[PDB]
DNA sequence: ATCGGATGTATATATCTGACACGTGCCTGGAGACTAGGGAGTAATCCCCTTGGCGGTTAAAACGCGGGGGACAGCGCGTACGTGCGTTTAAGCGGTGCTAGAGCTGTCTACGACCAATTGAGCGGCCTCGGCACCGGGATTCTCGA
């Protein structure tokens, strides 16, 4: 019929790690999808502006780090930047 | 056409809204005031909704148009 | 070997790279930007789903409904700032009564 | 015979409504109102079903929130009732007017 | 008929010098905070983030502008709250209510 | 550089409040106001310093403050915006 | 001979400049050939509409140089230019004279 | 030295046709320049967002019109769109 | 405070569906490999402008005090708001019908990116004088005590 992509299955895979026996309904999955979209758009927009300021064109893993430091609040920023640098380290090898 | 449909927002409805918000004793003149406030809010949102619809050459106000109209005003909405 | 598994993630690094490229953000998307961004998004959705499940458990249910996401977010103190302006549908209000009102 | 003291049913309703998540305004009169407010901007408007509800949901989270502030202003004047000069202050402080 | 033209000790009661300072400040447009104390305050606050920054001389000034245009505006709102409570003084419970309603505390 | 917030003295707060339009100050405002101003300054200089150390330099420019302001909803015209 | 693209439309603001900014600002993959013209027209209309009130103010104040205070007056005295610039702060613009009525003596 | 750009001379050419005898200051010129930049960014960003929802791949003279009609308040919108369409007509037929 | 009861709410068993969770094909978005090229990293260097220090001066801050206006507490009056009961009314729900208009696909072409040669608009550096800030001395208004 009509193909529309969403973050439902990944949200489900994460739920099955944080709580191995609970299950999201349909409305709550729609809400989590909208939340992921919103946060993605915030971080991407801030990284774009932050690259435009220093007169560059590559949006590399430094701009995303600085944008996470700007957007996310005090504590979430630390754990988010930690998870990010850990993942890029475990990916570049 | 329709006319004077704002009176459908009854007294018990505003009463229940206030009760959810935490109020305990509502004055008498409130109902008219909140009717005016709600009408203003709805006008401001539906204006942008209809603009977003017109731009796409459509005649049905989609749900994403209302979501975008609300987001453009710093009031996002999760679930549509 | 998908590029997400190579990082030890659950979010689709490929799809995030595609979105960053095709969203008109910058001229040349880097290499380790989608990995970082997918990791951040995964961390955040885990951090919110954990409290959502907790809230749904205390209410003796096994399904997470918007009431539980509302509770999980608004009860926290740093997610309530991130989602400071959103209105989760079917969410309701956090129960609270001003002390002056109750007898 | 028996009569709850004036004002004690207020808190019961407060706890009953703050705990649920239903929609407080009747759905059909609100559909009519939203459908006739948009008559000033176009005429052949159709208002897809899940749009109206969308609006309605937002249009509750506004009013409730507004009352959460109105009460404060009332409590500021050493009061209990929320008279219509509270809504105006609560809307002028946040820049809505 | 003639040609028309355009030209041809003490102690003020409390509350009058205030109504004069209001009129003489609401018409001026200079900065109302000393510059060296604000310099030092900005430099001292930026220690908690990075040790030794250099604060180009237009940065500091910039901040000062905003730091006025915030406080002033804040006071306006608090004023209303005071007038709302049927009084004339502005109290700390007014600033807190303004900041709460306005969204800065929640 | 310790305990400089006392540099926002009482007459400066009086003048700000006069320009704000208030008539009869209380006596406790002069500490609530310093607290508010310190919170605002921290919230702005944090993002200013982030913007200035992302660009690999050690001088807080005026564009950094303008950006850190515009990002919180409060723009500012006149300083190279 | 050449003929500036902003002179074929009766505009003063540059159209080639606006077009280069739209192209190299990463707003979209393609820029219509008449979008910069429309945008430059709107820009010069807004700047003329504000400069006119600024000059009116600077003249009704017996000066002959537009100055930030005059722009602040021209904006905050209007009703629609005030919503377009409800969040901005105009450096060195002061504030608008206003005193509540509960405060004025009786 | 490196040459940076602004809207100084164009704001001046507009001032010298709205008030043929007044003259702008320097700080007021910088304020008008940052104002023009800010409105430019607002309008172009909204136009982009709007030329994205509709999946178009270009930002045409109608995305700009709808952006101007969304961002600008009640009456400024009508005059702005009139000046815009007049300029675009006078430009296309030349 | 003490009961007595009367209303409301919370607890637990039965049952009943419909929405969530899982397995299936299958289509295209993601992964691998390789190349070319320009964007970013790195070394040199230069000069701007930030920091630091110092002396004078004088504007602004600090302190103390007298008292009058304002905040706050305490009472009576009365009205307008809540609670309960008996009415009306239209919301909601189910079921039918139907037609407008969203949505998707193929064909064609008008339009914007790209590239080359060029040339004049505007940008940086130089004067320079008129608008504006400053000062002084009138008139002119406003507040307050009598």
Swiss-Prot record, chain D:
PTM description: Acetylation is generally linked to gene activation. Acetylation at Lys-85 (H3K122ac) by EP300/p300 plays a central role in chromatin structure: localizes at the surface of the histone octamer and stimulates transcription, possibly by promoting nucleosome instability.
Major subcellular site: nucleus
Name this polypeptide is given: Histone H3.2
Positions carrying N6,N6,N6-trimethyllysine: 19, 42
Source organism per UniProt: Xenopus laevis
GO cellular component: nucleoplasm; nucleosome
Keyword Lipoprotein: yes
Subunit structure: The nucleosome is a histone octamer containing two molecules each of H2A, H2B, H3 and H4 assembled in one H3-H4 heterotetramer and two H2A-H2B heterodimers. The octamer wraps approximately 147 bp of DNA.
N6-succinyllysine modification, residue list: 19, 42, 85
UniProtKB/Swiss-Prot annotation, chain F:
Highest taxon of source: Eukaryota
One term under GO cellular component: nucleosome
Quaternary structure annotation from Swiss-Prot or TrEMBL: The nucleosome is a histone octamer containing two molecules each of H2A, H2B, H3 and H4 assembled in one H3-H4 heterotetramer and two H2A-H2B heterodimers. The octamer wraps approximately 147 bp of DNA.
Protein name: Histone H4
Modified sites of kind Phosphotyrosine: 30, 67
Predominant location: nucleus
Whole-protein residues included: 23 to 103 of 103
Positions carrying N6-(2-hydroxyisobutyryl)lysine: 10, 23, 38, 56, 58, 70
UniProt cross-link Glycyl lysine isopeptide (Lys-Gly) (interchain with G-Cter in ubiquitin), position: 70
Keyword Cytoplasm appears in the UniProt entry: no
Subcellular location(s) of the protein: Nucleus; Chromosome
N6-butyryllysine: modified positions: 10, 23, 56, 58, 70
Keywords linked to the UniProt accession: Acetylation, Chromosome, Citrullination, DNA-binding, Hydroxylation, Isopeptide bond, Methylation, Nucleosome core, Nucleus, Phosphoprotein, Ubl conjugation
Phosphoserine: modified positions: 26
Gene Ontology biological process: nucleosome assembly
Organism: Xenopus laevis
Cross-link Glycyl lysine isopeptide (Lys-Gly) (interchain with G-Cter in UFM1) mapped to chain: 10
Role played: Core component of nucleosome. Nucleosomes wrap and compact DNA into chromatin, limiting DNA accessibility to the cellular machineries which require DNA as a template. Histones thereby play a central role in transcription regulation, DNA repair, DNA replication and chromosomal stability. DNA accessibility is regulated via a complex set of post-translational modifications of histones, also called histone code, and nucleosome remodeling.
Keyword Membrane: no
Protein family: Belongs to the histone H4 family.
Chain positions with N6-lactoyllysine modification: 10, 56, 70
Sequence positions bearing N6-acetyllysine: 10, 38, 58, 70
Residues bearing PTM N6-propionyllysine: 10, 23, 56, 58, 70
Modified residues (N6-glutaryllysine): 10, 38, 56, 58, 70
Sites bearing N6-succinyllysine, chain numbering: 10, 56, 70
From Swiss-Prot, chain G:
Sites of N5-methylglutamine modification: 92
Highest rank taxon of the organism: Eukaryota
Modified residues (N6-glutaryllysine): 83, 106
UniProt GO BP: heterochromatin formation
N6-(2-hydroxyisobutyryl)lysine: residues carrying this PTM: 24, 62-63, 83, 106
Protein modification: Following DNA double-strand breaks (DSBs), it is ubiquitinated through 'Lys-63' linkage of ubiquitin moieties, leading to the recruitment of repair proteins to sites of DNA damage. H2AK119Ub and ionizing radiation-induced 'Lys-63'-linked ubiquitination are distinct events.
Tagged with keyword Lipoprotein: no
Molecular function terms, GO-annotated: DNA binding; protein heterodimerization activity; structural constituent of chromatin
Cellular location(s): Nucleus; Chromosome
UniProt KW Nucleotide-binding keyword: no
Transmembrane region(s): none
Covalent link Glycyl lysine isopeptide (Lys-Gly) (interchain with G-Cter in ubiquitin), residues: 1, 3
Record-annotated disulphide pairs: none
Keywords: Acetylation, Chromosome, DNA-binding, Hydroxylation, Isopeptide bond, Methylation, Nucleosome core, Nucleus, Phosphoprotein, Ubl conjugation
GO cellular component: nucleosome; nucleus
Residues modified as N6-succinyllysine: 83
Family: Belongs to the histone H2A family.
Function: Core component of nucleosome. Nucleosomes wrap and compact DNA into chromatin, limiting DNA accessibility to the cellular machineries which require DNA as a template. Histones thereby play a central role in transcription regulation, DNA repair, DNA replication and chromosomal stability. DNA accessibility is regulated via a complex set of post-translational modifications of histones, also called histone code, and nucleosome remodeling.
Name assigned to this protein: Histone H2A type 1
Organism of this sequence: Xenopus laevis (African clawed frog)
Curated annotation (Swiss-Prot), chain H:
GO CC terms of this entry: nucleosome; nucleus
Post-translational modification: It fluctuates in response to extracellular glucose, and associates with transcribed genes.
Keywords: Acetylation, Chromosome, DNA-binding, Glycoprotein, Isopeptide bond, Nucleosome core, Nucleus, Phosphoprotein, Ubl conjugation
Compartments, record wording: Nucleus; Chromosome
Cross-link Glycyl lysine isopeptide (Lys-Gly) (interchain with G-Cter in ubiquitin) per UniProt, renumbered positions: 90
Highest taxon of source: Eukaryota
Residues with attached carbohydrate: 82
GO molecular function, one term: structural constituent of chromatin
Family per record: Belongs to the histone H2B family.
Subunit comment: The nucleosome is a histone octamer containing two molecules each of H2A, H2B, H3 and H4 assembled in one H3-H4 heterotetramer and two H2A-H2B heterodimers. The octamer wraps approximately 147 bp of DNA.
Job of this protein: Core component of nucleosome. Nucleosomes wrap and compact DNA into chromatin, limiting DNA accessibility to the cellular machineries which require DNA as a template. Histones thereby play a central role in transcription regulation, DNA repair, DNA replication and chromosomal stability. DNA accessibility is regulated via a complex set of post-translational modifications of histones, also called histone code, and nucleosome remodeling.
Protein name: Histone H2B 1.1
Organism in which the protein naturally occurs: Xenopus laevis (African clawed frog)
Portion of the full-length sequence here: 32 to 125 of 126
């Amino acid at each position: 019929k009509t193909r529309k992509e969403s973050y439902a299955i990944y949200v489900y895979k994460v739920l099955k790690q944080v709580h191995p026996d609970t299950g999201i309904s349909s409305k709550a999955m729609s809400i989590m999808n909208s939340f992921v979209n919103d946060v993605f758009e915030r971080i991407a927009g801030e990284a774009s502006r932050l690259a435009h300021y220093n007169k560059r064109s590559t949006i590399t893993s430094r701009e995303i780090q600085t944008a996470v430091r700007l957007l996310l609040p005090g504590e979430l920023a630390k754990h988010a930047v930690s998870e990010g640098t850990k993942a890029v380290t475990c990916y570049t090898s | 056409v329709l006319r004077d449909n704002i009176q459908g927002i009854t007294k018990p409805a505003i009463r229940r809204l206030a009760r959810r918000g935490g109020v305990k004793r509502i004055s008498g003149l409130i109902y008219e005031e909140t009717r005016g406030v709600l009408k203003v809010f709805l006008e401001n949102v539906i204006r942008d909704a209809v603009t977003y619809t017109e731009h796409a050459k459509r005649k049905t106000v989609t749900a994403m148009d209302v979501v975008y109209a609300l987001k453009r005003q710093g009031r996002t909405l999760y679930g549509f | 070997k998908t590029r997400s598994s190579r990082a030890g993630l659950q979010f689709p690094v490929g799809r995030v790279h595609r979105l960053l490229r095709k969203g008109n953000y910058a001229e040349r998307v880097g290499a380790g930007a989608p990995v970082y961004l997918a990791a951040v998004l995964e961390y955040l959705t885990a951090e919110i789903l954990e409290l959502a499940g907790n809230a749904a458990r205390d209410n003796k249910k096994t399904r997470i409904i918007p009431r539980h996401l509302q509770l999980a977010v608004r009860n926290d103190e740093e997610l309530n700032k991130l989602l400071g302006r959103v209105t989760i549908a079917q969410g309701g209000v956090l129960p609270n009564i001003q002390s002056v009102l109750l007898p | 015979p028996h009569r709850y003291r004036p004002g004690t049913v207020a808190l019961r309703e407060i706890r009953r409504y703050q705990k649920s998540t239903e929609l407080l305004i009747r759905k059909l009169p609100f559909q009519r109102l939203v459908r006739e407010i948009a008559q000033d901007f176009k005429t052949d408007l159709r208002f897809q079903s899940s749009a109206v509800l969308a609006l309605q949901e937002a249009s509750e989270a506004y009013l409730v929130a507004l009352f959460e502030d109105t009460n404060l202003c009332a409590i500021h004047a050493k009061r209990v009732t929320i008279l219509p000069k509270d809504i105006q202050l609560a809307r002028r402080i946040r820049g809505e007017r």
